[PDB]
Enzyme design. Structure first.
Site, PDB file in Angstrom:
ATOM      1  N   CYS A 124     -11.462  85.349   8.800  1.00  0.00           N
ATOM      2  CA  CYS A 124     -12.519  84.354   8.636  1.00  0.00           C
ATOM      3  C   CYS A 124     -12.293  83.157   9.552  1.00  0.00           C
ATOM      4  CB  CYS A 124     -12.600  83.897   7.177  1.00  0.00           C
ATOM      5  SG  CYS A 124     -12.587  85.159   5.906  1.00  0.00           S
ATOM      6  N   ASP A 125     -11.123  82.508   9.445  1.00  0.00           N
ATOM      7  CA  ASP A 125     -10.889  81.213  10.088  1.00  0.00           C
ATOM      8  C   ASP A 125      -9.857  81.236  11.212  1.00  0.00           C
ATOM      9  OD1 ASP A 125     -12.436  80.495   7.714  1.00  0.00           O
ATOM     10  OD2 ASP A 125     -10.548  80.154   6.669  1.00  0.00           O
TER      11      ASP A 125
ATOM     12  N   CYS B 138      -7.705  83.432   4.938  1.00  0.00           N
ATOM     13  CA  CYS B 138      -8.364  84.557   5.586  1.00  0.00           C
ATOM     14  C   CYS B 138      -8.319  84.358   7.097  1.00  0.00           C
ATOM     15  CB  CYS B 138      -9.788  84.688   5.069  1.00  0.00           C
ATOM     16  SG  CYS B 138     -10.732  85.966   5.906  1.00  0.00           S
TER      17      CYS B 138
HETATM   18  C1  LIG Z   1     -11.520  79.956   1.473  1.00  0.00           C
HETATM   19  C2  LIG Z   1     -12.255  81.249   1.720  1.00  0.00           C
HETATM   20  C3  LIG Z   1     -13.017  81.389   2.878  1.00  0.00           C
HETATM   21  C4  LIG Z   1     -13.697  82.576   3.148  1.00  0.00           C
HETATM   22  N1  LIG Z   1     -14.427  82.667   4.313  1.00  0.00           N
HETATM   23  C5  LIG Z   1     -15.088  83.767   4.541  1.00  0.00           C
HETATM   24  C6  LIG Z   1     -15.854  83.859   5.770  1.00  0.00           C
HETATM   25  O1  LIG Z   1     -15.976  82.964   6.610  1.00  0.00           O
HETATM   26  N2  LIG Z   1     -16.505  85.066   5.932  1.00  0.00           N
HETATM   27  C7  LIG Z   1     -16.468  86.137   5.029  1.00  0.00           C
HETATM   28  O2  LIG Z   1     -17.107  87.165   5.271  1.00  0.00           O
HETATM   29  N3  LIG Z   1     -15.733  86.027   3.893  1.00  0.00           N
HETATM   30  C8  LIG Z   1     -15.083  84.916   3.669  1.00  0.00           C
HETATM   31  N4  LIG Z   1     -14.333  84.819   2.523  1.00  0.00           N
HETATM   32  C9  LIG Z   1     -14.294  85.978   1.606  1.00  0.00           C
HETATM   33  C10 LIG Z   1     -15.563  86.105   0.785  1.00  0.00           C
HETATM   34  O3  LIG Z   1     -15.886  84.812   0.274  1.00  0.00           O
HETATM   35  C11 LIG Z   1     -15.336  87.098  -0.359  1.00  0.00           C
HETATM   36  O4  LIG Z   1     -14.886  88.356   0.156  1.00  0.00           O
HETATM   37  C12 LIG Z   1     -16.623  87.315  -1.153  1.00  0.00           C
HETATM   38  O5  LIG Z   1     -17.127  86.058  -1.608  1.00  0.00           O
HETATM   39  C13 LIG Z   1     -16.411  88.179  -2.373  1.00  0.00           C
HETATM   40  O6  LIG Z   1     -17.621  88.162  -3.153  1.00  0.00           O
HETATM   41  P1  LIG Z   1     -17.635  88.695  -4.637  1.00  0.00           P
HETATM   42  O7  LIG Z   1     -19.088  88.500  -5.081  1.00  0.00           O
HETATM   43  O8  LIG Z   1     -17.070  90.121  -4.886  1.00  0.00           O
HETATM   44  O9  LIG Z   1     -16.712  87.660  -5.432  1.00  0.00           O
HETATM   45  P2  LIG Z   1     -16.444  86.094  -5.467  1.00  0.00           P
HETATM   46  O10 LIG Z   1     -16.924  85.487  -4.163  1.00  0.00           O
HETATM   47  O11 LIG Z   1     -15.095  85.837  -5.986  1.00  0.00           O
HETATM   48  O12 LIG Z   1     -17.535  85.606  -6.528  1.00  0.00           O
HETATM   49  C14 LIG Z   1     -17.385  85.866  -7.945  1.00  0.00           C
HETATM   50  C15 LIG Z   1     -18.043  84.762  -8.741  1.00  0.00           C
HETATM   51  O13 LIG Z   1     -18.267  85.204 -10.103  1.00  0.00           O
HETATM   52  C16 LIG Z   1     -17.737  84.239 -10.988  1.00  0.00           C
HETATM   53  N5  LIG Z   1     -17.224  84.853 -12.204  1.00  0.00           N
HETATM   54  C17 LIG Z   1     -16.031  85.515 -12.349  1.00  0.00           C
HETATM   55  N6  LIG Z   1     -15.758  85.861 -13.591  1.00  0.00           N
HETATM   56  C18 LIG Z   1     -16.828  85.352 -14.313  1.00  0.00           C
HETATM   57  C19 LIG Z   1     -17.148  85.388 -15.682  1.00  0.00           C
HETATM   58  N7  LIG Z   1     -16.363  85.942 -16.614  1.00  0.00           N
HETATM   59  N8  LIG Z   1     -18.295  84.798 -16.073  1.00  0.00           N
HETATM   60  C20 LIG Z   1     -19.072  84.221 -15.152  1.00  0.00           C
HETATM   61  N9  LIG Z   1     -18.884  84.141 -13.831  1.00  0.00           N
HETATM   62  C21 LIG Z   1     -17.734  84.723 -13.474  1.00  0.00           C
HETATM   63  C22 LIG Z   1     -16.614  83.554 -10.214  1.00  0.00           C
HETATM   64  O14 LIG Z   1     -16.272  82.296 -10.783  1.00  0.00           O
HETATM   65  C23 LIG Z   1     -17.231  83.470  -8.826  1.00  0.00           C
HETATM   66  O15 LIG Z   1     -18.043  82.303  -8.735  1.00  0.00           O
HETATM   67  C24 LIG Z   1     -13.627  83.634   2.222  1.00  0.00           C
HETATM   68  C25 LIG Z   1     -12.868  83.498   1.062  1.00  0.00           C
HETATM   69  C26 LIG Z   1     -12.176  82.315   0.804  1.00  0.00           C
HETATM   70  C27 LIG Z   1     -11.358  82.189  -0.458  1.00  0.00           C
END
Ligand SMILES: Cc1cc2nc3c(=O)[nH]c(=O)nc-3n(C[C@H](O)[C@H](O)[C@H](O)COP(=O)(O)OP(=O)(O)OC[C@H]3O[C@@H](n4cnc5c(N)ncnc54)[C@H](O)[C@@H]3O)c2cc1C
Ligand SMILES: Cc1cc2nc3c(=O)[nH]c(=O)nc-3n(C[C@H](O)[C@H](O)[C@H](O)COP(=O)(O)OP(=O)(O)OC[C@H]3O[C@@H](n4cnc5c(N)ncnc54)[C@H](O)[C@@H]3O)c2cc1C
Ligand SMILES: O=C(Cn1cccn1)Nc1ccc(O)cc1
Ligand SMILES: O=C(Cn1cccn1)Nc1ccc(O)cc1
Ligand SMILES: [Mg+2]
Ligand SMILES: [Mg+2]
Lengths: 305, 305
Positions: free
Chosen positions: B135-136, B132
């Protein structure tokens, strides 16, 4: 000097936009207003903003936001924008006798919650007076409270609140309700709700916290006092779109229209975020999310130029 | 036992939904997964999440979120949902050999960033390896870095990054680019970007931090090493919609479709939030905002029943 982006407003939308724009090296110029910091600057504890397991006061949260924007290089100005010219490659904002120009503008001016305008309403805000059952309804468990208003908003606030309150007295100045039939009958069906039509609040009483409301019949002038410890005001919201009316397309209630699930308005280079746009969720976290989207939209749009 | 709502997922979307649902007295049952806490659990510093003037680590932020949800009464289960039945008045989730039912389901499963799958990629994550640029990208000023991928994503990441990096080497395993013509020519026009076609990374080197990548020509097998201190992986995103495929309508890339600017899916009583839905912004703050909306949608929908 033509800036890359100017942000108008300093609630969660405007500051989150400033943080992203500044971290993207766009050097955003942000007009915060003299009443800066958005709606949370006027509340006490914010408990539903994710990231704070023990909660945080509204002003504490907002100052974190503000210092964060400053740390990445946002140029913050505690001043009102009085007029804008938003059409064309160079946009202008007028602040008193000063002008500022930018290639992109992010509208984050928010929405005003309509006030009753009665004595005691401002002083007891966050001390028994609230505008948001989702936000503060938690804190009125087993109490007798009032909800003021005659629309779907008041209906939804009143019915939601009965899962906390001992009782809810729903006060409206007419005998007719602009609420939809479904919302009105849900409230009528609720045993914890009593309706007071043809009734206005003239004053909210309370020594540090709300202890009662003085009522007046809007037909006869009969007055009385009601012992309650909460007053939820749900007489409507006014999006702060006056600056941009006639320039950006608005909906019939004044909210700025945006394209699809983006923040693009009807004008090239102009984006809108927060409660200026959203008449559905109206939370700090949703406003914050949409200010981030506005800044990503703007950066992508600027790169296309 | 039929719960009011079950939440599937534990990133910012799922936890913000849990906070709102719990504070609304819906007693949400949340399946977090064994790899709980979403994508931020796998990063270092989160600087653009509004509310933290000095930043916060990903795991710190996520645990605040988790404890906040617990404090308001969310029932959190560190377990994977293996199958769902989402149609009809009572929905079922299957977790190993256990079943749980609810009137409403909030899908918050996120999206997986595609991994290169090479040695060093996981260990140097947050230590030179990133997914990202928004992000970084900040942290690679005046450094030589690589971007991996051949689509609009990689194009946009590479061009954005040149405002920090000394140089950007954009690596792709074919000689043809699936990026749109506009995105491809923007990168070609950028003097800070060099293209390496027919090239894959076979390993990322680094003693605590990225120091280089080993390369292979995908046509000839010629290998060499490149001295760089950053690797941005932009080979695509996979929404985690496998559970719900054939039940909820998806778009052509697997993202859950939602109605208008709400979180309603194609199935009554089923709502979706976060990067499972959003292929445009993909930030913690936008995911957090949309999980709040999902819970407000669900509460309003439950009240209509
Ligand atoms: C390395 C990295 C760094 C980042 N840094 C930043 C940053 O500095 N700032 C920023 O704003 N964004 C950042 N992001 C992006 C941000 O983390 C994501 O956009 C955000 O977390 C998305 O949230 P979400 O809840 O939709 O999904 P996710 O964060 O993907 O969370 C989903 C969760 O649900 C769980 N899940 C999925 N399927 C199941 C299932 N069947 N049963 C149970 N649990 C399940 C997953 O395992 C996961 O733990 C970063 C992303 C990455 C990969
Ligand atoms: C009393 C109260 C308590 C609340 N409690 C909570 C809560 O606990 N949790 C929650 O999630 N939400 C809460 N909310 C709602 C939340 O505060 C709002 O949904 C959110 O702040 C909206 O953010 P916004 O940035 O779109 O606009 P606003 O917060 O309205 O911020 C807009 C700012 O821009 C400024 N501005 C406007 N026009 C101009 C101009 N022309 N020039 C310069 N500056 C200008 C305004 O003066 C204001 O400071 C509460 C609201 C109120 C009123
Ligand atoms: O309607 C207003 C004020 N207002 C602001 C903008 C437009 N009108 N006040 C009010 C006061 C007591 C009451 O019971 C009902 C309403
Ligand atoms: O494409 C993959 C792995 N993958 C995950 C899901 C589908 N494919 N890796 C990759 C590794 C080095 C490189 O230069 C380009 C790509
Ligand atoms: Mg304000
Ligand atoms: Mg994860």
């Amino acid at each position: 000097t033509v800036h890359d982006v100017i942000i108008i407003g300093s609630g969660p939308a405007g500051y989150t936009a400033a943080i992203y724009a500044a971290r993207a090296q766009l050097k955003p110029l942000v007009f915060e207003g003299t009443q800066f910091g958005g709606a949370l600057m006027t509340t006490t504890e914010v408990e539903n903003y994710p990231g704070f397991r023990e909660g945080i006061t509204g002003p504490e949260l907002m100052d974190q936001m503000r210092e964060q924007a400053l740390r990445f290089g946002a140029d913050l100005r505690m001043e009102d924008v009085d007029a804008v010219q938003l059409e064309g490659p160079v946009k202008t904002v007028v602040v008193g006798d000063e002008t500022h120009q930018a290639r992109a503008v992010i509208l984050a001016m928010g929405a005003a919650a309509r006030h009753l305008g009665v004595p005691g309403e401002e002083a007891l805000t966050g001390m028994g007076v609230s505008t948001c059952a989702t936000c503060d309804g938690f804190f009125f468990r087993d109490q007798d409270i009032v909800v003021v208003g005659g629309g779907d908003s008041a209906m939804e606030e009143a019915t939601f609140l009965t899962r906390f309150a001992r009782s809810v007295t729903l006060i409206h100045r007419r005998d007719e309700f602009r609420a939809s039939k479904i919302m009105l009958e849900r409230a009528r069906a609720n045993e914890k709700i009593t309706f007071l039509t043809n009734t206005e609040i003239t004053q909210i009483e309370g020594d540090p916290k709300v202890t009662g409301v003085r009522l007046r019949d809007t037909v006869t002038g009969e007055e009385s006092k009601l012992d309650v410890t909460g007053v939820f005001v749900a007489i409507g919201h006014d999006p702060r779109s006056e600056l941009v009316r006639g320039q950006v397309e608005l909906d019939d209630e004044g909210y700025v229209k945006v394209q699809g699930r983006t923040t693009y308005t009807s004008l090239d280079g102009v984006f809108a975020a927060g409660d200026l746009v959203d008449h559905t969720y109206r939370q700090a976290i949703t406003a914050a999310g949409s200010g981030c989207a506005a800044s990503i939209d703007a950066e992508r749009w600027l790169a296309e130029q």
